[PDB]
Curated annotation (Swiss-Prot), chain A:
Organism the protein comes from: Saccharomyces cerevisiae (strain ATCC 204508 / S288c)
Record's keyword terms, sorted: Acetylation, Cytoplasm, Nucleus, Proteasome
Protein name: Probable proteasome subunit alpha type-7
Gene for this chain: PRE10
Processing after translation: The alpha and beta forms are probably products of the same gene with different post-translational modifications.
GO BP, sorted A to Z: proteasomal ubiquitin-independent protein catabolic process; proteasome-mediated ubiquitin-dependent protein catabolic process
Subcellular location: Cytoplasm; Nucleus
From Swiss-Prot, chain G:
Localisation: Cytoplasm; Nucleus
Record-listed E.C. numbers: 3.4.25.1
Protein name, per record: Proteasome subunit beta type-1
Keyword Transferase listed: no
Biological role: The proteasome degrades poly-ubiquitinated proteins in the cytoplasm and in the nucleus. It is essential for the regulated turnover of proteins and for the removal of misfolded proteins. The proteasome is a multicatalytic proteinase complex that is characterized by its ability to cleave peptides with Arg, Phe, Tyr, Leu, and Glu adjacent to the leaving group at neutral or slightly basic pH. It has an ATP-dependent proteolytic activity. PRE3 and PRE4 are necessary for the peptidyl-glutamyl-peptide-hydrolyzing activity.
Keywords for this protein: Acetylation, Cytoplasm, Hydrolase, Nucleus, Protease, Proteasome, Threonine protease, Zymogen
Description of how the protein assembles with itself and partners: The 26S proteasome consists of a 20S proteasome core and two 19S regulatory subunits. The 20S proteasome core is composed of 28 subunits that are arranged in four stacked rings, resulting in a barrel-shaped structure. The two end rings are each formed by seven alpha subunits, and the two central rings are each formed by seven beta subunits. The catalytic chamber with the active sites is on the inside of the barrel.
Primary location recorded for the protein, binned into one broad class: cytoplasm
Misc: The side chain of Thr-1 acts as a nucleophile, and the N-terminal amino group acts as a proton acceptor.
Keyword DNA repair attributed: no
Gene name as annotated: PRE3
From Swiss-Prot, chain H:
Chief place of localization: cytoplasm
Protein name: Proteasome subunit beta type-3
Sequence positions bearing Phosphoserine: 29
Sites of the Glycyl lysine isopeptide (Lys-Gly) (interchain with G-Cter in ubiquitin) crosslink: 68
Organism (species): Saccharomyces cerevisiae (strain ATCC 204508 / S288c) (Baker's yeast)
Disulfide bonds: none
GO biological process: proteasomal ubiquitin-independent protein catabolic process; proteasome-mediated ubiquitin-dependent protein catabolic process
Keyword set includes Transmembrane helix: no
From Swiss-Prot, chain I:
Section of the entire sequence shown: 30 to 249 of 261
Identification of the protein by name: Proteasome subunit beta type-2
Localization in the cell: Cytoplasm; Nucleus
Catalytic activity reported: Cleavage of peptide bonds with very broad specificity
Active site: 1 (nucleophile)
Source species: Saccharomyces cerevisiae (strain ATCC 204508 / S288c) (Baker's yeast)
Length: 240, 245, 231, 240, 228, 187, 196, 203, 220
């Protein structure tokens, strides 16, 4: 009843309704997916072409933290940019203190603490984005997903946004059919296919596909966009 | 972020501070504790209730040494009492001992605790403490003393008193057995008899806490050499309570 | 509606109503059009006046020698954002001897707008902006909304009845895309586009303002007789 | 946190301060205090509100060697204000090497009270004070101050549960040429007549006098012990 | 109202604290802690093919000797874990010896009490169980709740199905404190949980934390299977 | 800098040099009437003296307005001493020495106080600041009597001023008594 | 003070003397200049005793927090934490530190932080007042992939010469060996190393 | 040296059941005598304090200690004893560890409950010196030490203690250029205090 | 001043002299230089007397509060750390040179602390202006295993050497012994080898020799 009008107010059943409303805001965004391969991570996202006047290949969504972390999000894009700026500040501080690129689980914990801190007071609003991020460190490849409540987990494959159900089903089938794992390029192709399949829920507007990856044997442990012939091959595979 | 710069305790149209009354209700729902003043000591007593049968009740003590000659007990909310005891010890050290080299008298320390409790009923964005305190002490120039401090910061000196669920019955019993000539042993016996009425479960040394402000204890003073150097406050072990039962 | 009191409250469906009210404030402003080619970028603005004895409200603000914008909505918010953009461009020039990119300025405006929709005690801005510039990557046009969303487009229009101008721009995209080296033709295309949003008024030298930036052209504003040849 | 603010420092449509009036109503339910000034001294008499427990070691307080106060209301707020007043008197003595006039201290306390009424978001002090003092300017002085920040000077005054009846009694039987003993008798008679109890015993009273002499110098403050109160009650005629 | 912030109800209650207690049971996971007179053992009941199982855990290593188990939502759990790690490190720096379990529990309980008394702070909907082998007290289990209340235990259980485990533990102790046996204590706790709840806990259904004299560690799934 | 003061049975007489220190042609007055029955004379570093004297005068006038009452000379001297003692510990201490003359109406007696820049207050029958004492104290010690009248005090002050002029122009002479503060014109 | 650290085939070895002086008076015959900051990360301290002790305490605290949050820190990370304190407070502190660590991947590593607050990674490092007298000998005798016995002998000879020529160094020779097998302590008395 | 600008000396001795505290009266700037009526001894109830050093610091400390003793009496409802006042003086002095008062305070009194005379001295930063025989302070401290180590006896009646302390003070002040323009002695018993002004050579 | 600390088989003993001077003039012939941080933790301080006393008092108050908070007996290392950090914060401007000894649940401990914050651990330590003679005695006679009686004798001998040979040290000897299972034993004036001989005469003046100008009664 009256327990939904302020943040950080427990309901009689032990719920925070503002965070659930933020999840509702997240559910209205576009579909963002992440796949963990044998030696890296692949991030894919769909961008709606609302008007033909939008300049193609501009308005980049996927963002980079340090030189090895990739981040994508679904929900209110400015909130995602705020979170990415905070993550860049955290990574810079860690690098300055300890002279080593920040490990992915440590970065995930710092982001989670920052998101959680916005559910503790009624003078602030929870973040309305769900974030899929990851990369490569000395321990290997890591993929994480973070929710508006501040809870995060590590995933074999993650999906968020309006077309999350079909994307999750496709990711589960992909994981089941490849127990050994997947290569980076095969992961890029599968991400293209899954984004195209998940777009079939929203056929009212056209979309553009954006793909990035961070792999040890393909990018030497750095985060790089897919723009060349590989992007066209992935698009052709998805449309096939 | 913190915008609670305004008082949460305000006067009702009838002239009553609702939050302090509600804190008093919370105190009145608490377990019984008692204090009795004798000619050569003071006794402070309380019941020890366990949240779980698997909990080691010895790790939780409802009677706390404030100074070597001053101790305290409470009825109400436990964590509030714990924080208040920490603050009281710190104020005793930083307000009196670091200035005069001596521990404060009982009355001044009670006044400091009362100031702390009052500040929680007028400062912004703070809930008043939901405890009532009984403080027993001894000082050179005033003798033995017993005080009661309320959630509003009001404190009163008592020859004997009780707080908690069985407050009225215990107060009547103590009124009927006051003669201005009791000794410490008589006061301990009276306290045990009064507690036996207000305890519904087992009544032994593991469910009662007793403390005394009596005579100096050179055994509880881990050094020798200074003739002027005693910790009057003493907590009775469960074995002694069982023996007295 | 109990969820529209402040900017830190979500609705049960996940909507921020103060942001939507600021967008509504934008939708009641005078129409402005932005357009660009591979060599030049142009802004066309229709001014408004209180009455005949009044002057017309300025709608185009210069940010730097290579960058400017036009506003639709609450003018003081446009002044605040324009001052911030001027400071950022000046900082880039002073510290790096570098001309600030248009995309980075859009990012800065997005970040500044986002902070006003998440904390108590502050309202979102009440203006939409069209930003044109020329940098090492060529000509750029951006659209900024007070929700923080910034988009890069070939052309657009904002304000009241801007849909007709937007449809005209969408239809004639391939034409004005290739107007390179002929600034007057691009300006005339923009004027024709903004003519689609007029209902009961005609363009005059008092209510029409134009701005242009380009490869060899610093950001310049034409008003009054300077636009008489474009009517 | 705007919802939870009660706005303790705002006017009413009639131009009244609700918190000040409510604090006055709160004070109207406290033990009665009476101050009477004669030609050669001042008498303060307060009625406790009682059990058969410790009394010799709550309503009468000492500010300096020449000024005392009687309290009606919350005791802890009164103690706060009394500590501030004692510090102020000592500061005045340190600065000017003279004893502070009564009116200056009273006005300082009244200003402190008024500040809580005008600015800030905190509740006012629910305390009324009766000041009895001596200075070289006017001699013996009696004042009262309420939560509204107003202070007044009185020949005879009462504050508390039965102010109306006590004031009506004091309007008669008071003369400008009375003595200290006559003032003591009048205060005791008024307390006995206004008391809502079976008898006016010594264990429910506090007494104080300020006069000249009595094994002292210019001015002596005497705070009556329970035995002295009993003797005075026997002498006057109450015999309770 | 009085049911939205931490102020007294007319009955002297604090509704937000009670609601945080309710929130502590959002995850349907039970945990059990026992002592073995030379070690302390805690066992939790971790319950999607897309998740990475190794990243799911409610058992934290606060320091070299102190371990923690949390009942409640994972964000508040990680908040409390970070706070406890910082407090233990500060204690060791300031006083020159390792922080004991009971003092850390008291400090966390004081923070919880501060939350229950200050309006702008909300309580954390978690229950914290600290285990160690103190150099002065031997095996130690202490528990703190959203109300600011903490106590030590001979053994303890947390979760929705905690009454059955508590009753079974009390019956075992009445038969007869502590467990007179770390691996044996771990197997005892596993069997106790199996008897209390039912079914057969596989290596993926539980997580085990063991505190010995100079260490606290967590067993892998292979070690848990070795226990089975 | 000549600052001198003599307290006689019913009054206080202060003398201050009417000289400055350049090139100009004026008749400087180094005294401020703190109250109708309290006067202060000052000497020391230029700038600091006038500022300090005006600050003290403003505070005393404010107190007099607030209480509708005149502070006694003792209270004024104590306040000035407190101000100087605070100043000596500050970042920029005042380098000012003062003589305070007054006529206590309650006690109906004249009072003279001498305070230095450190904050040392002394009540004296006669006092001086600077080098006036070194050349005046022999005469003051030989000739002073506590029961002297106003004319006798003026004659003694005239002898002191002549002695000062021997080892050097003119002085300003102020009288504080029951009728208040006045300036001597025949001197 | 004469401190050094030498990398060898199986790990690293730190060595130091034990003399503390207040001018001409030996205020402590038996000083431990080898301070542990983590289970297999140690340091040799030279300069102001108070400054080096405070820095080592702060570094140990920071590394404990790092271990609780992120895992086992590397030797380079510990050297960086030392470097931050030395460089940012170089106008108030006098500290020359040799950080020596072991890990499974990098084996043994040595970093030197001289006055000023710069960090240099070296196969071996030497510091202190008595180091100047052994710059040649060590440069003439250091090899790589030496066995444990050879490294012990090298450190013993070098420190014996440094003690012999430097009046501010002396006492016993303390050594700490960091290898995969763990941490080992060694001590050598004057009657042993003075016959060399 | 600020402590040697104004001059002055204070002595204190213990009797059988009595105490004595004496001071000089001179106040001078550098070498010119300003006042011969500057007393360095004050009392707060039955506790006596004598301060040597800067005259401004003497007055300031007297006012501050009067403030603190009045507040102590108001809160405690009893006068402060010499033993507690000594700790109060030490703490007040150490609170200015780096901007210290240039003072030489000496405390003398009789404990009301015990009746035992008490005496103590302080440096400028509050170090306490407890003595059973005597305490000296001022510019003529060495002369006072020489007089006291020779004239003092462990148990003296107040009549003899007066002569002893007076002779020590006078003979130490006659060898100090900055001390001596008059002299005051206080003889303090349980129920009586006597103040005497001595005759002196002046110059 | 001379201050020493010596360990033995089941505890630790500290010792000090009792002379405090201001230059060449003796200000206090019997001064206490053994300070009680806690009932079984004692510190002996040289350098600035006021600094030593104030710092020991502050650290003792904090240690007592910490012991109440933790419900445990104080440890020597805690006092060492707190003293060390407080002294290092002031960069040597607090002139306290301490020997801190004690017994705690972990055993017996002896440490030395300098005014800049450096600390040392040793079986035998000396500090003060007479520390050289005391250290000469300690190096001459200290043994690895000592009984309580031998340790007391050795510490007293070192303090006596400082008394005899150092001008800034003298008068009496104060000792404090702390044993693992016993109470702390504080021996004030354990040895008093400097007792002034009787004077050649008595200088008691006859009554009436001092001239008096005025007399009055003071009301207290």
């Amino acid at each position: 009843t009256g327990y939904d009008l302020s943040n950080s107010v427990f309901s009689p059943d032990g719920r925070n309704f503002q965070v659930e409303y933020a999840v509702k805001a997240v559910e209205n965004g576009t579909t963002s997916i992440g796949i963990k391969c044998n030696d890296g991570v692949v991030f894919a996202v769909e961008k709606l072409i609302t008007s033909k006047l939008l300049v193609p290949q501009k308005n980049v969504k996927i963002q980079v933290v340090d030189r090895h972390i990739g981040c994508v999000y679904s929900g209110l894009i400015p909130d995602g940019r705020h979170l990415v700026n905070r993550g860049r500040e955290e990574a810079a501080s860690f690098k300055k203190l300890y002279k080593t690129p920040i490990p992915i689980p440590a970065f995930a914990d710092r982001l989670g603490q920052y998101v959680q801190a916005h559910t503790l007071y009624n003078s602030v609003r929870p973040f309305g984005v769900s974030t899929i991020f990851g990369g490569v460190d000395k321990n290997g490849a890591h993929l994480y997903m973070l929710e508006p409540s501040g809870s995060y987990w590590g995933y074999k494959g993650a999906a968020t946004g309006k077309g999350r159900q079909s994307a999750k089903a496709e990711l589960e089938k992909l994981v089941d059919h490849h127990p050994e794992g997947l290569s980076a390029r095969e992961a890029v192709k599968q991400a293209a296919k899954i984004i195209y399949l998940a777009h079939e829920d929203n056929k009212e507007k056209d979309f553009e596909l954006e793909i990035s990856w961070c792999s040890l044997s393909e990018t030497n442990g750095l985060h790089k966009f897919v723009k060349g012939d590989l992007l066209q091959e992935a698009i052709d595979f998805a449309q096939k | 972020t913190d915008r609670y710069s305004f008082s949460l305790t305000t006067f009702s149209p009838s002239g009553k501070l609702g939050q302090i009354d509600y804190a008093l209700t919370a105190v009145k729902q608490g377990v019984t504790s008692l204090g009795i003043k004798a000619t050569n000591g003071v006794v402070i007593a309380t019941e020890k209730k366990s949240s779980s049968p698997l909990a080691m009740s010895e790790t939780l003590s409802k009677v706390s040494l404030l100074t070597p000659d001053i101790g305290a007990v409470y009825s109400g909310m436990g964590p509030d009492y714990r924080v208040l005891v920490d603050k009281s010890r710190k104020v005793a050290h930083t307000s009196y001992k670091r200035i005069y080299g001596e521990y404060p008298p009982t009355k001044l320390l009670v006044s400091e605790v009362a100031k702390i409790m009052q500040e929680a009923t007028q400062s912004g964005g703070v809930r008043p403490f939901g405890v009532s305190l009984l403080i027993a002490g001894h000082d050179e120039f005033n003798g033995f003393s017993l005080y009661q401090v309320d959630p509003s910061g009001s404190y009163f000196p008592w020859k004997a008193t009780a707080i908690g669920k069985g407050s009225v019955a215990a107060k009547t019993f103590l009124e009927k057995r006051w003669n201005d000539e009791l000794e410490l042993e008589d006061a301990i016996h009276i306290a045990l008899l009064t507690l036996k009425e207000s305890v519904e479960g087992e009544f032994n040394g593991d469910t009662i806490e007793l403390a005394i402000i009596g005579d100096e204890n050179p055994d509880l003073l881990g050094y020798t050499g200074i003739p002027t150097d005693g910790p009057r406050f003493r907590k009775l072990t469960s074995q002694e309570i069982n023996d007295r039962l | 509606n109990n969820y529209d009191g402040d900017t830190v409250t979500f609705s049960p469906t996940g909507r921020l109503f103060q942001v939507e009210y600021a967008l509504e404030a934008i939708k009641q402003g005078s129409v402005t059009v932005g357009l660009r080619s591979n060599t030049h970028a142009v802004l066309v603005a229709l001014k408004r006046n209180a009455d005949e004895l009044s002057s017309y409200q300025k709608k185009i603000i210069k940010c730097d020698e290579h960058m400017g914008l036009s506003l639709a909505g609450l003018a003081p918010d446009a002044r605040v954002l324009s001052n911030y953009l001027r400071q950022q461009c000046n900082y880039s020039s002073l510290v790096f001897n570098r001309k600030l990119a248009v995309e980075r300025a859009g990012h800065l405006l997005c970040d500044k707008a986002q902070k006003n929709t998440q904390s108590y005690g502050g309202r979102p801005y009440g203006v939409g902006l069209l930003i044109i510039g020329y940098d090492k990557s060529g000509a750029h046009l951006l659209e900024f909304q007070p929700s923080g969303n910034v988009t890069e487009l070939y052309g657009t229009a904002i304000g009241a009845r801007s849909q007709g101008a937007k449809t005209y721009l969408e239809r004639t995209l391939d034409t004005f895309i290739k107007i390179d080296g002929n600034p007057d033709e691009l300006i005339k295309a923009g004027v024709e586009a903004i003519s689609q949003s007029l209902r009961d008024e005609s363009l005059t030298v008092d209510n029409l303002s134009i701005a242009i930036v380009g490869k060899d052209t610093p950001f310049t504003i034409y008003d009054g007789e300077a636009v008489a040849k474009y009517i | 946190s705007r919802r939870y603010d009660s706005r303790t420092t705002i006017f009413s449509p009639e131009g009244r301060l609700y918190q000040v009036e409510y604090a006055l109503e709160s004070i109207s339910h406290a033990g009665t205090a009476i101050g009477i000034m004669a030609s050669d001294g001042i008498v303060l008499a307060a009625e406790r509100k009682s059990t058969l427990l410790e009394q010799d070691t709550e309503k009468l307080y000492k500010l300096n060697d020449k000024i005392a106060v009687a309290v009606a209301g919350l005791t802890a707020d009164a103690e706060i204000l009394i500590n501030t007043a004692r510090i102020h008197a000592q500061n005045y003595l340190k600065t000017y090497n003279e004893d502070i006039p009564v009116e200056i201290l009273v006005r300082r306390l009244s200003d402190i009270k008024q500040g809580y009424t005008q600015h800030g978001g905190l509740r006012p002090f629910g305390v009324s004070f009766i000041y009895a003092g001596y200075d070289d300017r006017y001699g013996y002085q009696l004042y009262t101050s309420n939560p509204s920040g107003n202070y007044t000077g009185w020949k005879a005054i009462s504050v508390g549960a039965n102010t109306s009846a006590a004031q009506t009694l004091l309007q008669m039987d008071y003369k400008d040429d009375m003595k200290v003993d006559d003032a003591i008798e009048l205060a005791l008679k008024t307390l006995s007549k206004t008391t809502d109890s079976s008898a006016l015993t010594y264990d429910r009273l506090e007494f104080a006098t300020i006069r000249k002499g009595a094994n002292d110098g210019e001015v002596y403050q005497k705070i009556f012990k329970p035995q002295e109160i009993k003797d005075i009650l026997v002498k006057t005629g109450i015999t309770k | 109202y009085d049911r939205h912030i931490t102020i007294f109800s007319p009955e002297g209650r604090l509704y937000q604290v009670e609601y945080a207690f309710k929130a502590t049971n959002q995850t349907n996971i039970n945990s059990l802690a026992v002592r073995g007179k030379d070690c302390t053992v805690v066992i939790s009941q971790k319950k999607d093919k897309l998740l990475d199982p190794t990243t799911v855990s409610y058992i934290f290593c606060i320091s070299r000797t102190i371990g923690m188990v949390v009942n409640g939502p994972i964000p508040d759990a990680r908040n409390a874990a970070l706070r406890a790690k910082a407090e233990a490190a500060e204690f060791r720096y300031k006083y020159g010896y390792d922080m004991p379990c009971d003092v850390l529990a008291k400090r966390m309980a004081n923070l919880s009490q501060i939350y229950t008394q200050r309006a702008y702070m909300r309580p954390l909907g978690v229950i914290l169980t600290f285990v160690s082998v103190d150099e002065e007290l031997g095996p130690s289990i202490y528990k703190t709740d959203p109300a600011g209340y903490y106590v030590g235990y001979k053994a303890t259980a947390t979760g929705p199905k905690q009454q059955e485990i508590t009753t079974n533990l009390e019956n075992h102790f009445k038969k007869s404190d502590h467990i007179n046996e770390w691996e044996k204590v771990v197997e005892f706790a596993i069997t106790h949980m199996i008897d209390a709840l039912g079914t057969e806990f596989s290596k993926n259904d539980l997580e085990v934390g063991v505190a010995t004299k100079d260490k606290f560690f967590t067993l892998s799934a292979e070690n848990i299977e070795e226990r089975l | 800098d000549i600052i001198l003061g003599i307290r006689v049975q019913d009054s206080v007489i202060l003398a201050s040099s009417k000289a400055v220190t350049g090139i100009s042609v004026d008749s400087d007055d180094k005294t401020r009437q703190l109250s109708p029955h309290t006067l202060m004379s000052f000497a020391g570093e230029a700038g600091d003296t006038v500022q300090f004297a005006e600050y003290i005068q403003a505070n005393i006038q404010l107190y007099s307005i607030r209480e509708d009452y005149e502070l006694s000379p003792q209270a004024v001297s104590s306040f000035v001493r407190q101000e100087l003692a605070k100043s000596i510990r500050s970042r920029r201490p005042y380098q000012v020495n003062v003589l305070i003359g007054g006529y206590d109406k309650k006690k109906n007696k004249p009072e003279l106080y001498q305070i230095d820049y450190l904050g040392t207050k002394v009540e004296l029958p006669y006092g001086a600041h600077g080098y006036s004492g070194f050349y005046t104290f022999f005469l003051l010690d030989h000739h002073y009597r506590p029961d002297m009248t106003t004319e006798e005090g003026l004659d003694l002050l005239k002898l002191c001023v002549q002695e000062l002029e021997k080892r050097m122009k003119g002085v300003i002479v102020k009288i504080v008594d029951k009728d208040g503060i006045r300036q001597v014109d025949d001197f | 003070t004469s401190i050094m650290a030498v990398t060898f085939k199986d790990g690293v070895i730190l060595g130091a003397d034990s003399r503390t002086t207040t001018g001409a008076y030996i205020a402590n015959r038996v000083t431990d200049k080898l301070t542990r900051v983590h289970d297999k990360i140690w340091c040799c301290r030279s300069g102001s005793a108070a400054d080096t002790q405070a820095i080592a305490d702060i570094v140990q605290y920071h590394l404990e927090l790092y271990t609780s949050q992120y895992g086992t820190p590397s030797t380079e990370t510990a050297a960086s934490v030392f470097k931050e304190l030395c460089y940012e407070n170089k106008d108030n502190l006098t500290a020359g530190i040799i950080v020596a660590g072991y890990d499974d991947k990098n084996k043994g590593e040595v970093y030197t932080i001289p006055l000023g607050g710069s960090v240099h990674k070296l196969p071996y490092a030497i510091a202190g007042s008595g180091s100047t007298f052994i710059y040649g000998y060590c440069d003439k005798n250091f090899r790589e992939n030496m066995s444990k016995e050879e490294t012990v002998d090298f450190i013993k000879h070098s420190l014996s010469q440094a003690i012999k020529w430097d009046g501010s160094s002396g006492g016993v020779i303390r050594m700490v060996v960091l290898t995969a097998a763990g941490v080992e302590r060694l001590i050598f008395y004057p009657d042993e190393y003075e016959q060399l | 040296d600020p402590s040697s600008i104004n001059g002055g000396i204070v002595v204190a001795m213990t009797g059988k059941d009595c105490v004595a505290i004496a001071c000089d009266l001179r106040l001078g700037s550098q070498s010119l005598g300003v006042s011969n009526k500057f007393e360095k001894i004050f009392h707060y109830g039955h506790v006596f304090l004598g301060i040597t050093g800067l005259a401004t610091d003497v007055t300031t400390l007297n006012e501050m200690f009067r403030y603190k003793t009045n507040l102590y009496k108001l809160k405690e409802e009893r006068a402060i004893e010499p033993e507690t006042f000594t700790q109060l003086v030490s703490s007040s002095l150490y609170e200015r560890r780096f901007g210290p008062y240039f003072v030489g305070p000496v405390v003398a009194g009789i404990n009301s409950k015990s009746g035992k005379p008490f005496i103590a001295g302080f440096d400028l930063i509050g170090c306490i010196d407890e003595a059973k025989d005597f305490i000296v302070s001022g510019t003529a401290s060495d002369q006072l030490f020489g007089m006291c180590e020779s004239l003092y006896e462990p148990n003296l009646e107040p009549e003899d203690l007066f002569e002893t302390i007076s002779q020590a003070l006078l003979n130490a002040a006659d060898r100090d250029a900055l001390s001596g323009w008059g002299a005051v002695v206080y003889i303090i018993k349980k129920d009586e205090v006597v103040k005497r002004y001595l005759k002196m050579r002046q110059d | 001043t001379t201050i020493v600390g010596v360990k033995f088989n089941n505890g630790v003993v500290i010792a000090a002299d009792t002379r405090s001077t201001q230059g060449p003039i003796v200000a206090d012939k019997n001064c206490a230089k053994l300070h009680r941080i806690s009932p079984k933790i004692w510190c002996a301080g040289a350098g600035t007397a006021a600094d030593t006393e104030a710092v020991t008092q502050l650290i003792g108050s904090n240690i007592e509060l910490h012991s109440l908070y933790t419900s445990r007996e104080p440890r020597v290392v805690s006092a060492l750390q707190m003293l060390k950090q407080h002294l290092f914060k002031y960069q040597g401007h607090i002139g306290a040179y301490l020997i801190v000894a004690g017994v705690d649940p972990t055993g017996s401990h002896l440490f030395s602390i300098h005014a800049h914050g450096s600390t040392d651990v040793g079986y035998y330590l000396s500090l003060g202006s007479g520390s050289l003679a005391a250290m000469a005695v300690l190096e001459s006679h200290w043994k690895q295993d000592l009984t309580k009686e031998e340790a007391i004798k050795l510490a007293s001998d070192a303090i006596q050497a400082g008394i005899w040979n150092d001008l800034g040290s003298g008068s009496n000897v104060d000792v404090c012994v702390m044993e693992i299972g016993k109470d702390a034993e504080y021996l004030r004036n354990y040895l008093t080898p400097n007792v002034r001989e009787e004077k050649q005469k008595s200088y008691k003046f006859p009554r009436g020799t001092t001239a008096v100008l005025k007399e009055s009664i003071v009301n207290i």
